[PDB]
Amino acid sequence: DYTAGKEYVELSSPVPVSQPGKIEVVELFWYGCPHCYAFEPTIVPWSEKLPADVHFVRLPALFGGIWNVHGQMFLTLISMGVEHDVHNAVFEAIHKEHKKLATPEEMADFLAGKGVDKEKFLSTYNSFAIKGQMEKAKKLAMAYQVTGVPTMVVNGKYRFDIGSAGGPEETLKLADYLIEKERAA
């Protein structure tokens, strides 16, 4: 009962998924995005309930400038295996504390207060591996043809957002439907 062209669109060139064999669900976001921050209370509990044949992943939108800096912070924290602990603190710092987290040094200093090894964070942030992940994330955003956040992509095939779905819970209901659609092939 959803309609292609209305609540979601189908990408003419489907994008490969990060984990072959599971239905992918991507949330594209930016730590500095107030709507992304506001969406967290809805998308987190939902994501924790996803079944085992679904792979949920957050992808930072690398649209330039501060988005890229913040995105590089995200990727560095994921690589370090500590993003999920400090995830909420980063959002809180940017939106409630007015912290800019605009340079690697400001980031390290702040994250150290949250338990994150400063020396490892900085070495990782500047590593070739993270540079490759940034390159991939950029190309992905280009392939999804995403121009704002938060935006969802299901299985590299369907793009939608809170506006198109008609609200944050409606967005997840739409994701559920499209996950089911992809199961059916």
UniProtKB/Swiss-Prot annotation:
Family matches, as CDD domains: DsbA_DsbA
Domain of life, per lineage: Bacteria
Pfam families: DSBA
Gene Ontology CC terms: outer membrane-bounded periplasmic space
BP terms from Gene Ontology: cellular response to antibiotic
Keyword set, alphabetical order: Disulfide bond, Periplasm, Redox-active center, Signal
GO-annotated molecular function: protein disulfide isomerase activity; protein-disulfide reductase activity
Localization in the cell: Periplasm
Domain Thioredoxin per the UniProt entry, residue ranges: 1-180
Intrachain disulfide bonds: 33-36
SUPFAM superfamilies linked: Thioredoxin-like
Function field: Involved in disulfide-bond formation. Acts by transferring its disulfide bond to other proteins.
Family per similarity comment: Belongs to the thioredoxin family. DsbA subfamily.
Protein name: Thiol:disulfide interchange protein DsbA
